[PDB]
């Protein structure tokens, strides 16, 4: 509490309102100037990059960015404009410009104009509260720009100034004698929600009359398109409601018109809720400590975190298949010279994971900040006499250990289940022998087709149920190995691994057929013989989301489901009967019998072709029905996978793993039960320890629990990233086209570890992304310097280094070096910067898994 | 603040035709594929009778220049429609197995470098942006199965 | 819409389920101090 | 981990092959068992199973350093290339299992995103042998050292790439359980390579 | 469905072996420092 | 020191270890009890 | 001969800029934290 | 034999080199304490 600690804590709560208000208004104005520049960065003369690409789908949907507009403009407004001083537009003049460049420049300028003015008006409230300020204090870096000192004594934002430099003439909100103004923060909740309702109404008027998207049901009967004037329902997506990439009319609320009708809906709701609160503001005793801005800061901030998580979820679904993003896949997208696989989905993934990441940070930081309010209360005596039940509901220390311990138990059980299943199935997929057990892989041999006429040597047991049976090789009467055709494989049969070409399982010798004539519920339309070893395909159904999704889809699609089932049925019967006819040919034994047989097969054949084409086309019609929750790349149903089931369990376990430190902040900011047995009392929110006593105590403060939340949460977050970008999370080594994935029509990019090496071969083909990869790795491992129990070693070595450098200064007569003292971070600041370095390392590196492309092929 | 925009540079495109942005054309599928079809066919003849006079003559000037550098058109090895020639081993772009087992990024370098014996290198004939357009046109030849 | 509603309902359901467990423990261990 | 490895398969002899020549195959300097109880069975058995061109090859012998190793100049003589299935199998499975499985799978059906899948008939029909050499030699895609399909012109010899080319045509129309066997190579070679 | 009854037996033995072993190293690490 | 109860777990872990190795190495070697062969 | 000299000059500049920058980070760390 | 002797001597000269350096620093900063 003397070093660097007073720099990132210089602006703490509570604060006066004019100071919060003006500072927010200035940030708003600054964020509008930055978006201004992003509009300039989106014009059509620039390369694709990750900024202008995250904005383009939305700019298309608004009609600002026209995808099919090539005509160059040469005059538009004021007379004669080939190019000027910076030219016809400042510096945009050497370029050829279209209408969408002008729209983009118009919107960019507005943003910059309205931003700059919001910055000024915000400084009028901010500096105006203080009576006013000087150009030299506002800007502060003008003292050392000699000359300009006569215009750095001028006072701005003053109370009685001439109009153009006034600030707040009555000094503060509370003194100004306007009765409309509300005097507390509860009271003010009402005009705030009226103001927000009005911002909605503004966006809908702009949508309707400036962007020309009327609200449903007042949509136009026709729209203008690059091919002329077209009925709304046939005009393609940016212009009308017809989705080209799915080839269907869009629901009316799936369009930007749907969005302008919701503008008016939401606006009316917010205005009415504000009118209600104008007569009935919040009042209960449970809430009146929230007038302190330090306390509401906790409520608001972790609320916004939850809002951010909810944006991620809603946005993901709503837009995973929307024509805004798919339209990027036809725009010849080139980044750092390259050509991207599926840039639509990539950009979509980046926006949703960016919201996800904001959600975690703000929830955690809101809780941390709340822990600071509560520690304050304890350390001044008034925690024990808080009156709101939102504090007092959790004061009993024994309830606090019951809450925490059962959320540890729930975390434990569900993480053990998830991770334990991942481990079981990587054992299965890798065919590992443990001596005590042999893991066995999925393997499939087609049994219909022409592949069902391929022969195999088969070792057949007689009676698996008599231990001490044994088996024999299937043979001819002549003694030589009979080749069994795949159609005649039976359950129990063993085939040599090396007759199948398998070199990856050298520890066991045979594949066992465990199921014949198998057709995947969801998968390829074929019939198979299977070794299910240890691979647990049933685990897909251990997912409550498998069942809700499939039940609702069955209900919407019941009678094509039913006909597809009857087609499969008729086909399996035809296959079986055709296999018996083929077998009578094989074993016919005398050409009279062999002609009779071949003539029977020749007569059944047309009918077996009919049943196959029937099954094929019902199974194709079934696989093109609309998705509910689990989706294709073309918004079609897919069954849930082992991957989806693992992701369900990992969300429960891993978010509880990551959030148990936050419950420790909320309950144990002053005393945990380990502290309370010793009589200890944590004296501040950020102390590093108090140890070596009792074995050592590093990491009990609230600041540290915040850092341990951030780390532990890296684990569910990376589950989310792998799952968005198409990794397979249910094992560690899944290969892209392994027999299981191929037979069950699953597309994935890798499998835990394998994903990592699989995506990085794509990452290596971009030299900007490989530079990012190198820098990312270096930031991270340096966090270890700062996080290991080693600060004393670093202090005592730094000291040797300082002595030495001062010896060199004194010897060589170099005055700048005879008093060097190297600065060595203390333990608290080492933990802060260690968490910073750990976090940023990891998440630059994750950006790369998204930036490489979306390789899921659906 | 940081990305004040983002300084990514200006986009490389093809040749300019007066009054119609070439940079823009290079991201608008119907414009880029019209130029890909011209390169692919070696003529402006299969272009929509709706094509403007200026367009039809800019393409011809493009071809005439390429004819002096001994450029060989893609059609007629591969045909006007795909799926080349088994005789010459010329690739069939209509085939779905050929299409699934190629990425568009990968396809690029096989046109740049040429491919084994007969398919010629185009690195000294065409710009990398004109190869990108052709990879996009070849994509639209795919048939099912 | 159906997918968005299902996903949100499942997140709030995980919270509600945790509340119910954590309150089946509190209600039936009320005679025992944790320690 | 150690000692309790299994019994060795009697069909994999350890009987020794002749040593790799010191002289470069591209040299312009001077160009390019007994009767003891079981020594003849062991030599005959080594002649089918133990590979001769598996080892990385002298640096002057790599295809980028070989005067006749460029895609434009290599000789793809079909009579020499599809002459002997034992040999294609002996050599190409050792080279493939080592170098190519990582990215193309243990079944050779594709592991790394967008990777080839050699069992696909449509892919087989539309590739030449010379085409397959070009993509091994050059790599596929833009990047340093080839793209996502890496280049091999330092790394492999022209003779090693040719065993790879012939082996890869045994993948045609097989199922997704490991690699082509000796009789896959033989049915491929009988149906004209 | 005998593969799903067989598979499940294995998976259940895996969980007893592993979680039994984990809480076996936690019980033997308490005898080496306190009991 | 070891409790009776912790000695009776260490017995269940060994029964699961030789029910696994007995069914893994017996059919490999004795060519019987074919149900468990691979 | 001349390429080599040109390359030595770039490498020197890089060492002057990266080591130079690193020490400035230390000095700045020093001024914040204390003196 | 030649490569073995060279390597060995290069490691032994790595230690001998360092000592000499250290000896130069000690002698030429005699009478400056390093406090
Ligand atoms: C060919 C691959 C290539 C090479 C060059 C490479 C090598 C190495 C080395 C080395 C010497 O070999 C190191 C030391 C190293 C280090 C790292 N790399 Zn690294 N690395 C590569 C590539 C990359 C890339 C692109 C990325 C990393 C990422 C990272 C990161 C990871 C930091 C970290 O702690 O991350 C924790 C999260 C992990 C490991 C991901 C787990 C994902 C999984 C799907 C989650 C769910 C499943 C589990 C069983 C879950 C538990 C259950 C529950 C609690 C949720 C650091 C800098 C990083 C990352 O994983 O971040 C989460 C990252 O994004 N790396 N990495
Ligand atoms: C919606 C209610 C608000 C909230 C409103 C208030 C108000 C008002 C008060 C507090 C107060 C407290 N809150 Mg709070 N607080 C919220 C969330 C949290 C969370 C959390 C993990 O999310 C924690 C750990 C805390 C903890 C705390 C303490 C710092 C403090 C008093 C102890 C305690 O109450 O234990 C809390 C323990 C928990 C176990 C609760 C966790 C569950 C929360 C309620 C909801 C999560 C679900 C969310 C809706 C899911 C989102 C949906 C999806 C996005 C689709 N709050 C949410 C955002 N909180 C009091 C205070 O004094 O601080 C200044 C106080 O008066
Ligand atoms: C070796 C260092 C390195 C270099 C040379 C580049 C260079 C580039 N970056 Mg990368 N970048 C790096 C490291 C690097 N970056 C690291 C560590 C991160 C994580 C913070 C990033 C994150 C990143 C993003 C998200 C983006 C880039 C982009 C760019 C490009 C335009 C940059 C620019 O406008 O600068 C001028 C701007 C500043 C100096 C700051 C403002 C350019 C190709 C953009 C691009 O699209 O390229 C494809 C882009 O969107 N950069
Ligand atoms: C990049 C990795 C890195 C570097 C360069 C260092 C550097 C050092 N460590 Mg730290 N350390 C690291 C990581 C690193 N460490 C990790 C991962 C851990 C966890 C185990 C630690 C734990 C740790 C402990 C406990 C201690 C140290 C100590 C030391 C110092 C040894 C004294 C000395 O040998 O002088 C020789 C100097 C060098 C050999 C390094 C030269 C500078 C390097 C090469 C490059 C600068 C690179 C940097 C990333 C550049 C960014 C610059 C910016 C402009 C881009 C030295 C300053 C000791 C010490 O005395 O404390 C001061 C010490 O006690 N290290
Ligand atoms: C998942 C675990 C796993 C499995 C199933 C195996 C399997 C095996 N290991 Mg590997 N090993 C592993 C992990 C594993 N190892 C780990 C973590 C290490 C690092 C210490 C090693 C280090 C290793 C070496 C150095 C060796 C092997 C060897 C072996 C083989 C003989 C095993 C043996 O003799 O056992 C009986 C073992 C015991 C009864 C324990 C003693 C066998 C294939 C040998 C082999 O040659 O492989 C081809 C061998 O030389 N192991
Ligand atoms: C390092 C360690 C901490 C981790 C190591 C984990 C690796 C082992 C984990 C699994 C162990 C399973 C125990 C063996 C077991 O019971 O599974 C086999 C079981 O069959 C029992 C019989 C026992 N008869 C009756 C023969 C004596 C046997 O295995 O021999 O059913 C299966 O075989 C399941 C078959 C799978 C699909 C059908
Ligand atoms: C490339 N192919 C992957 C995507 O394929 P597709 O779109 O077909 O299928 C899914 C499935 O649906 C879900 O996956 C819904 C969540 C279920 C909750 C399951 C139950 C959740 C309960 C957890 C409660 C935790 C509490 C108690 C701490 O695609 C998605 O929706 C995933 C994208 C969304 C991104 C994740 C959003 C954040 C995760 C939840 C945040 C939680 C926080 C508020 C803490
Ligand atoms: C009284 N002593 C103890 C109590 O006080 P106490 O510990 O807070 O004092 C610290 C400690 O010392 C360090 O913490 C070491 C830094 C030097 C290592 C030097 C090594 C740094 C290199 C690391 C880079 C690796 C990354 C890139 C992977 O307080 C701080 O340094 C606080 C951190 C603030 C630093 C701000 C950096 C911004 C400067 C950027 C612009 C400078 C130049 C560009 C002009
Ligand atoms: C695995 C490990 C544990 C085992 C270590 C192996 C040890 C092997 C010992 C290495 C033996 C080398 C001799 C062979 C050789 O040097 O070859 C001929 C060499 O003739 C000699 O000088 C002969 C004199 C050799 C008398 C030296 C005895 C060595 C002592 C070992 C001490 C080990 C310690 C204590 C660490 O030729 P030239 O250099 O002239 O020509 C270049 C060759 N192109
Ligand atoms: C003279 C014939 C000829 C001309 C002209 C020709 N090609 Fe080819 N091309 C071939 C043959 C032959 C192959 C088969 C390559 C091989 O051996 O595998 C092929 C292969 C290809 C492939 C498949 C490559 C791959 O990787 O798999 C593409 C794409 C292709 N050509 C595009 C073009 C384009 C684009 C042009 C014109 C710009 C063009 N070709 C001109 C003959 C030609
Ligand atoms: C690093 C991963 C990787 C390794 C190692 C690798 N490949 Fe590939 N391979 C790919 C990818 C990715 C493709 C798809 C390229 C494309 O279209 O984008 C591919 C494609 C191919 C193609 C088809 C080329 C064509 O033009 O159609 C052949 C042939 C090929 N690989 C053979 C091999 C052989 C032989 C080896 C070992 C020598 C090998 N590969 C090693 C990743 C790899
Ligand atoms: S090593 Fe650090 S954290 Fe641990 S007791 Fe000592 S000072 Fe505290
Ligand atoms: Ca990706």
Short mmCIF file of N, CA and C in Angstrom, two decimals, chain B residues 79-116:
data_model
loop_
_atom_site.label_atom_id
_atom_site.label_comp_id
_atom_site.label_asym_id
_atom_site.label_seq_id
_atom_site.Cartn_x
_atom_site.Cartn_y
_atom_site.Cartn_z
N UNK B 79 -13.82 -28.82 -71.09
CA UNK B 79 -15.13 -28.54 -71.81
C UNK B 79 -15.91 -27.32 -71.39
N UNK B 80 -16.95 -26.92 -72.04
CA UNK B 80 -17.64 -25.73 -71.65
C UNK B 80 -18.45 -26.00 -70.44
N UNK B 81 -18.88 -27.20 -70.27
CA UNK B 81 -19.57 -27.60 -69.11
C UNK B 81 -18.91 -28.35 -67.95
N UNK B 82 -17.58 -28.62 -67.79
CA UNK B 82 -16.95 -29.68 -66.87
C UNK B 82 -16.78 -31.16 -67.42
N UNK B 83 -16.07 -31.59 -66.48
CA UNK B 83 -15.89 -33.03 -66.46
C UNK B 83 -15.45 -33.44 -67.68
N UNK B 84 -14.28 -32.93 -67.84
CA UNK B 84 -13.28 -32.95 -68.80
C UNK B 84 -13.24 -33.96 -69.78
N UNK B 85 -12.11 -34.55 -69.83
CA UNK B 85 -11.83 -35.50 -70.77
C UNK B 85 -11.07 -36.67 -70.25
N UNK B 86 -11.66 -37.83 -70.20
CA UNK B 86 -10.90 -39.00 -69.89
C UNK B 86 -10.42 -39.28 -71.27
N UNK B 87 -9.13 -39.19 -71.48
CA UNK B 87 -8.37 -39.36 -72.74
C UNK B 87 -7.16 -38.60 -72.42
N UNK B 88 -7.38 -37.38 -72.02
CA UNK B 88 -6.41 -36.47 -71.67
C UNK B 88 -6.19 -36.41 -70.22
N UNK B 89 -6.95 -37.17 -69.46
CA UNK B 89 -7.04 -37.16 -68.02
C UNK B 89 -7.52 -35.81 -67.52
N UNK B 90 -8.25 -35.01 -68.28
CA UNK B 90 -8.65 -33.73 -67.79
C UNK B 90 -9.73 -33.72 -66.87
N UNK B 91 -9.48 -33.17 -65.73
CA UNK B 91 -10.46 -33.17 -64.65
C UNK B 91 -11.91 -32.83 -64.93
N UNK B 92 -12.81 -33.67 -64.39
CA UNK B 92 -14.34 -33.53 -64.41
C UNK B 92 -14.83 -32.74 -63.18
N UNK B 93 -15.15 -31.49 -63.35
CA UNK B 93 -15.52 -30.63 -62.25
C UNK B 93 -16.95 -30.88 -61.79
N UNK B 94 -17.72 -31.60 -62.57
CA UNK B 94 -19.06 -31.96 -62.17
C UNK B 94 -19.06 -33.00 -61.09
N UNK B 95 -18.00 -33.68 -60.82
CA UNK B 95 -18.04 -34.75 -59.89
C UNK B 95 -17.88 -34.38 -58.43
N UNK B 96 -18.82 -34.82 -57.66
CA UNK B 96 -18.94 -34.58 -56.27
C UNK B 96 -17.87 -35.08 -55.41
N UNK B 97 -17.22 -36.20 -55.72
CA UNK B 97 -16.10 -36.80 -55.04
C UNK B 97 -14.90 -35.99 -55.28
N UNK B 98 -14.58 -35.56 -56.49
CA UNK B 98 -13.55 -34.57 -56.80
C UNK B 98 -13.85 -33.26 -56.00
N UNK B 99 -15.04 -32.73 -56.05
CA UNK B 99 -15.37 -31.51 -55.28
C UNK B 99 -15.24 -31.63 -53.80
N UNK B 100 -15.66 -32.74 -53.15
CA UNK B 100 -15.48 -32.91 -51.72
C UNK B 100 -14.03 -33.12 -51.35
N UNK B 101 -13.23 -33.63 -52.23
CA UNK B 101 -11.91 -33.89 -51.73
C UNK B 101 -10.90 -32.80 -52.07
N UNK B 102 -11.37 -31.61 -52.43
CA UNK B 102 -10.60 -30.40 -52.69
C UNK B 102 -11.06 -29.27 -51.80
N UNK B 103 -10.18 -28.53 -51.13
CA UNK B 103 -10.56 -27.24 -50.58
C UNK B 103 -10.27 -26.17 -51.61
N UNK B 104 -10.97 -25.11 -51.53
CA UNK B 104 -10.80 -23.97 -52.41
C UNK B 104 -9.45 -23.32 -52.24
N UNK B 105 -8.99 -23.04 -51.04
CA UNK B 105 -7.59 -22.70 -50.88
C UNK B 105 -6.61 -23.66 -51.52
N UNK B 106 -6.78 -24.97 -51.36
CA UNK B 106 -5.88 -25.91 -51.98
C UNK B 106 -5.93 -25.88 -53.48
N UNK B 107 -7.12 -25.79 -54.05
CA UNK B 107 -7.32 -25.75 -55.50
C UNK B 107 -6.51 -24.67 -56.19
N UNK B 108 -6.46 -23.48 -55.60
CA UNK B 108 -5.69 -22.32 -55.99
C UNK B 108 -4.28 -22.69 -56.46
N UNK B 109 -3.50 -23.39 -55.63
CA UNK B 109 -2.09 -23.62 -55.96
C UNK B 109 -1.90 -24.64 -57.05
N UNK B 110 -2.80 -25.55 -57.22
CA UNK B 110 -2.82 -26.43 -58.33
C UNK B 110 -3.05 -25.72 -59.66
N UNK B 111 -3.89 -24.68 -59.76
CA UNK B 111 -3.91 -23.78 -60.92
C UNK B 111 -2.67 -22.90 -61.06
N UNK B 112 -2.13 -22.33 -59.98
CA UNK B 112 -0.91 -21.50 -59.99
C UNK B 112 0.31 -22.23 -60.52
N UNK B 113 0.55 -23.44 -60.05
CA UNK B 113 1.72 -24.25 -60.22
C UNK B 113 1.60 -25.22 -61.35
N UNK B 114 0.40 -25.45 -61.82
CA UNK B 114 0.07 -26.58 -62.65
C UNK B 114 0.07 -27.94 -61.99
N UNK B 115 -0.41 -28.94 -62.64
CA UNK B 115 -0.52 -30.20 -62.01
C UNK B 115 -0.17 -31.21 -62.96
N UNK B 116 0.77 -32.00 -62.59
CA UNK B 116 1.44 -33.06 -63.24
C UNK B 116 1.50 -33.45 -64.66
#
